[PDB]
Amino acid sequence: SMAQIKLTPEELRSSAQKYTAGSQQVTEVLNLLTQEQAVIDENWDGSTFDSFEAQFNELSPKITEFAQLLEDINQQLLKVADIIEQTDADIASQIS
Amino acid sequence: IKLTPEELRSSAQKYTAGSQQVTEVLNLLTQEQAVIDENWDGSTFDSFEAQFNELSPKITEFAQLLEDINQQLLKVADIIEQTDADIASQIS
């Protein structure tokens, strides 16, 4: 329902940008450190970081789930923003 | 350990910077989730709100893990640096 949305198309698009920037950063961190984790693993034998590696692997899927949620929110806000903007265009031109 | 103290410290820096960046994103977008909720009445946005809220605690756990890894890498680096100095002194 459009009556419930108190943000303008431009405001929706400003918010959206924060979510996509956020998604990209979280992904950049995850990928960088996923790699660090392997550099360490390869260059360090023993069980001394086994608990860290297991906690990391277990949390990792939560982190990719998060990055994709943020990107999905960006996409939805963008689409809703276009819909509302088009609604204003139509009301202004089709209503006398 | 095939890694020098310097390499360990360079790696540690990445974990702590990553920890901070992940936390900053969570913080910014937690605030933005509240702005949208306050400015979008009804239950339409409830699904995105719910997913975000469920994941939030795990994002916090993840940032804390990165900082813990950072701190241990730094401790290990200190230990190995003393070892390097003792070996060098012994041979010299």
Contact call for residues A17 and B6 (beta carbons, < 8 A): no
Q: Is B40 strand, coil or helix?
A: strand
The technique by which this structure was obtained is: X-ray
* CA nearest to B18 within chain A: A29
Q: Identify the bridge partners of residue B40 per DSSP, sorted by sequence position.
A: A5
Domain boundaries, chain A: 1-96
CA-nearest of B16, B35, B20 to B74 is B16
Q: Identify the bridge partners of residue A5 per DSSP, sorted by sequence position.
A: B40
Residue A94 buriedness (CB in 10 A; 0-12 / 13-18 / 19+)? exposed
Q: How far apart are CA A28 and CA B60, in angstroms?
A: 17
Q: How far apart are CA B43 and CA B10, in angstroms?
A: 46
Q: How far apart are CA B82 and CA A2, in angstroms?
A: 66
Q: How far apart are CA B90 and CA B22, in angstroms?
A: 44
Report CA dihedral (B13, B16, B18, B22) to the nearest 10 degrees: -170
A26-31, long-range: CB < 8 A, 24+ apart:
A26/A63, A26/A66, A26/A67, A26/A70, A26/B21, A26/B22, A26/B25, A27/A64, A27/A67, A29/B18, A29/B21, A29/B22, A30/A60, A30/A63, A30/A64, A30/A67
Q: To which CATH superfamily is domain B1-92 assigned?
A: ESAT-6-like (1.10.287.1060)
Fold adopted by A1-96: Helix Hairpins (1.10.287)
Q: Locate A64 and state its tokens.
A: 């990719």
Contact call for residues B23 and B4 (beta carbons, < 8 A): no
Please name the residue that has the structure tokens 């984790």. A37
* CA nearest to A5 within chain B: B40
**A26: which chain B residues are within 8 Å (Cβ-Cβ)?**
21-22, 25
Q: How far apart are CA B35 and CA B28, in angstroms?
A: 11
Which residues between 46 and 85 in chain B have a beta carbon less than 8 angstroms from any beta carbon of chain A? 48, 51-52, 55, 58-59, 61-62, 65-66, 68-69, 72
Q: Judge: B1–A39 Cβ closer than 8 Å, yes or no.
A: no
Task: Return the DSSP state at B42.
Answer: S
Q: Locate B77 and state its tokens.
A: 């680096």
